[PDB]
C-alpha cells in the first residue's frame, strides 16, 4: 500500500547492505526465480540439474557453430555438437572438484515434503556432497544432450533481414 | 468515508512467503537412475577424465588424410 512496501533497507535492519530497491526484491522479479535454487531448495539438487544442464545446454551452438574458428560450417558435424560437447565436459568436473569444497557426508532423502519447510538456517551451506553430485550429475545429462536438440534441430532460421 | 475504502480486499495480505505456485513438472524419476554413472557417483570422475578426455582428443586429434593446419 505505502510509498514502497512499509518502506525498508533489507528485510529489516539497515546494517547489512542489499539496499533492497527494485531489481532486488519486487514481487515482479523475486517470483521469476523460485521453482529453482533461489529462495528455497525445491526437490533436492538432483533434477534441477538437467533443466540447468539442458537450458544452458542448447546455448553454446551458434556461439561455436556460427562464430566457430573457421565459421559457417559445411561439415555435417557442426551447426551443433562438433566439439562443444566439450565445454559441458570441461566444466562438468569444473564442478565436481568444487563439490570437494562440499563434503559433509549423508543420506536423508527429504525431497518429499513434511512440515512447511524453511530448511531454516537454509542459508550458509546445508547442502552436503551427496547432493552436489546429483546436480553436477544432472549437469552432464543436460550439457551433453542439451547440445543435440540444438544440433538435431535442423535449422529454419531467421536471418539478417 | 467512501475513500475510506477498507483496503478493497486486504489480500491477507501478504499472500505469503506463502504460496504463489505449486512446484516442478512431474518429469522426474523419468530419469530415476536414468543416466546413472554420475548417479552411481560412489567413487568416480577419475574414469571420466581418462575416458571422456581420451575421446575428445584421441580421435579428435589424428585424422586419416589431413585437411591440414
Amino acid at each position: 500500500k505505502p510509498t514502497y512496501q512499509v518502506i525498508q533497507p533489507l528485510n529489516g535492519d539497515p546494517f547489512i547492505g542489499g539496499l533492497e530497491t527494485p531489481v532486488t526484491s519486487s514481487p515482479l522479479i523475486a517470483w521469476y526465480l523460485s521453482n529453482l535454487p533461489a529462495y528455497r531448495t525445491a526437490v533436492n539438487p538432483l533434477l534441477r540439474g538437467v533443466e540447468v544442464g539442458l537450458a544452458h545446454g542448447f546455448l553454446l551452438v551458434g556461439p561455436f557453430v556460427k562464430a566457430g574458428p573457421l565459421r559457417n560450417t559445411e561439415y555435417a558435424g557442426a551447426a551443433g555438437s562438433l566439439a562443444a560437447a566439450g565445454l559441458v565436459v570441461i566444466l562438468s568436473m569444473c564442478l565436481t572438484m568444487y563439490g570437494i569444497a562440499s563434503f559433509k557426508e549423508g543420506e536423508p532423502s527429504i525431497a518429499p515434503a513434511l512440515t512447511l519447510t524453511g530448511r531454516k538456517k537454509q542459508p550458509d551451506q546445508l547442502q552436503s556432497a551427496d547432493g552436489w553430485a546429483k546436480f553436477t550429475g544432472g549437469f552432464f545429462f543436460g550439457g551433453v544432450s542439451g547440445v543435440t536438440w540444438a544440433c538435431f534441430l535442423m535449422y529454419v532460421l531467421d536471418l539478417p533481414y | 468515508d467512501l475513500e475510506d475504502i477498507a483496503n478493497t480486499t486486504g489480500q491477507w495480505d501478504v499472500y505469503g512467503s506463502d504460496a504463489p505456485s505449486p512446484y516442478n513438472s512431474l518429469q522426474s524419476k523419468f530419469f530415476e537412475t536414468f543416466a546413472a554413472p554420475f548417479t552411481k557417483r560412489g567413487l568416480l570422475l577419475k574414469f571420466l577424465i581418462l575416458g571422456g578426455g581420451s575421446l575428445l582428443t584421441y580421435v579428435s586429434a589424428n585424422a586419416p588424410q589431413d585437411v591440414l593446419p
Binding site: 572438484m97 570437494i100 569444497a101 | 577424465i49 582428443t57 586429434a61 585424422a63 586419416p64 588424410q65 589431413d66
Partner: peptide, 30 residues
C-alpha cells in the same frame, strides 16, 4: 594407414594440464 603422430601435444599441453589444475586443486583440498 598414413600420417598420424598427433597426441603428444594434447596429452601434454592440454590433458596433462587438466590432470594438475584438477589434481593440484589439492592445494585447496583433496
Amino acid at each position: 594407414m598414413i600420417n598420424l603422430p598427433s597426441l603428444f601435444v594434447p596429452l601434454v599441453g592440454l590433458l596433462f594440464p587438466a590432470v594438475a589444475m584438477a589434481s593440484l586443486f589439492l592445494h585447496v583440498e583433496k
